[PDB]
A paper describes a structure:
The protein TON_0340 (268 amino acids) was identified in a transcriptome study aimed at identifying genes whose expression is enhanced when this organism was grown with CO as the sole carbon and energy source. The biological function of TON_0340 is unknown, and a BLAST database search shows that TON_0340 belongs to the DUF4392 superfamily (after domain of unknown function), the members of which are found in all three domains of life. To gain insights into the biochemical function of TON_0340 and its homologues, we determined the crystal structures of TON_0340 in four different forms; the apo form without a bound metal ion and the Mn2+-, Mg2+- or Ca2+-bound form, revealing that the protein has a highly conserved bi-metal binding pocket. Our analyses strongly support that TON_0340 is a novel Mn2+-dependent phosphatase.
The Ca2+-bound TON_0340 structure was determined by growing the crystals in the presence of CaCl2. Unexpectedly, only one Ca2+ ion bound to the cluster of the acidic residues. The Ca2+ ion was chelated by Glu59, Asp61, Glu115 and Asp157 occupying the Mn2 site. As anticipated, Ca2+ exhibited single-site interaction with TON_0340 with the deduced KD of 970 nM. Notably, TON_0340 was not activated by the addition of Ca2+ or Zn2+. Consistently, in the asymmetric unit of the Mn2+-, Mg2+-, Ca2+- or Zn2+-bound crystals, six molecules of TON_0340 formed three dimeric pairs which are essentially the same with each other, as if this observed homodimer is the biological unit. The two molecules in each pair are in antiparallel orientations. The intermolecular interactions, involving α1, α2 and α10, are mostly hydrophobic and quite extensive, burying a surface area of 1,202 Å2 in one subunit.
Numbering used by the authors:
A (entry chain A): 1 to 269
B (entry chain B): 2 to 8, 12 to 269
Write the structure that this text describes.
């Protein structure tokens, strides 16, 4: 099953434990997130972009996942726009994505976050190593969306992302520096994964099975990562221009994606 | 690794609870494995009612482990049913003969029926298995203190006794089919073969060498399928295991090889 694969053991015991606890109570969190996705495709706002201290530059985890979701919305007949930082918009330029401008929650049927920093209990933004993120935040539209009743989905793998507020207790207990970095920002549905991109691919894969079409087909993980890496997006863990995500090399990401495609093809028959 | 291997709904819930309970079950299984490679007895083979013929989940994993044992400089032998020996013949594995528990430094089971609370054997659909058992040597091993490792994905296999409480709470027909046979360490996975591969993957990371490199899932499964081993779910001679087609299995193996490399490099 998809939710389990996207949480494949990658050495981050903290998040694995979060996933274990989260799933014990919300076993079908992926399916529920997919149902919300599929019911609100008219105009989707996809938010991504995670500044990495000390440089505060955006990283490779998040944009690829946002791109895969954007792509699936268009293929499913809906419309999507992306809200993110400058360097990310540049990295995604080759892919022709529509960039949101002066976005207001009400203008969309759904708002999705993929690896976006969420304010912590002290109102500040922190990275996994507990360093403060110094840059204009992107979570504000989520607070407004919730106050408006606008459907929201969060995807994260660290505990400090938009949407994690929903399981803050799990993060504070299982993740290093959890009390300080855990986000308080909640979303209607939440996808926890070992790498945020995989969470986004899982949403696409689950949706694919729901509609009977493989929405991940044609996705080239290696090309996408190489392209955004060449554009300046760094690896969030190593903090260098390595063509990797969270310190994990491409063959693993490719293995996840190919396995996801195989599971979808099999499920569709 | 201990995760990827647990990717239907019933067993997924058992794994989740099992992992939550003994978070390092895969690592502890691997430790016992590496510490006792002298002469390893690998048991496998699972009669599928009503024909009582062995299936494709079990032998491949047993083969991967057999191979890993030799690559590490140890010796292995396989205890299984005749049709399984036939299917593994092309691989040249040593077959156990009049096996005595004291002769081995470790005994491992990959998808082998374990007796239930009432002393009988049951398939996942609560149908009684009627064929000479293979679990007897594990009861002797335990009493003798000989290291034992069990691998299963249903709840009715050798080794599942360690978590019968979990099996009853999530598996259909649980109270009846759940095995009471315990092993020192237990690996639970979505498919037994995958659990075995995880063992090899973890062992690989531990020794800094990809012991899975070269494993060709398609050749192995097609070969045993041709030899007569049936798919445990469909009960047909298709080249699949547990009703899951080969491309998914290949994807799991490919992912495990990549995870291993990530750790060794
Ligand atoms: Ca991440
Ligand atoms: Ca099985």
């Amino acid at each position: 099953m998809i939710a389990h694969l996207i949480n494949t053991d990658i050495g981050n015991r903290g998040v694995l434990k979060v996933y274990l606890d989260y799933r014990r109570k919300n076993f079908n969190f992926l399916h529920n997130s997919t149902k919300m996705f599929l019911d609100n495709l008219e105009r989707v706002l996809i938010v991504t972009g995670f500044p990495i201290p000390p440089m505060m530059v955006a990283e490779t985890d998040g944009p690829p996942g946002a791109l895969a979701i954007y792509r699936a919305v268009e293929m499913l007949g809906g419309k999507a726009e992306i809200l993110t930082y400058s360097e990310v918009e540049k990295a995604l330029e080759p892919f022709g994505v529509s960039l949101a401008r002066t976005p207001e929650p009400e203008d969309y049927s759904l708002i999705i976050s993929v690896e976006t920093p969420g304010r912590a209990a002290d109102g500040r933004y922190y990275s996994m190593s507990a360093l403060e993120i110094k840059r204009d935040p992107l979570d504000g539209i989520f607070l407004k969306a919730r106050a408006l009743g606008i459907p929201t989905i969060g995807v994260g793998d660290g505990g400090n992302e938009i949407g994690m507020g929903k399981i803050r207790e799990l993060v504070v207990g299982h993740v290093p520096h959890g009390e300080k970095i855990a986000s308080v920002v909640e979303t209607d549905e939440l996808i926890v994964s070992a790498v945020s991109n995989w969470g986004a691919y899982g949403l696409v894969a689950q949706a694919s099975i729901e509609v009977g079409r493989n929405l991940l087909e044609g996705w080239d993980e290696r090309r996408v990562i190489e392209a955004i890496s060449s554009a300046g997006l760094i690896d969030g863990v190593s903090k260098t221009l390595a063509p990797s995500v969270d310190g994990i090399r491409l063959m693993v990401h490719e293995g996840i994606v190919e396995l996801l495609k195989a599971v979808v093809d099999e499920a569709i028959l």
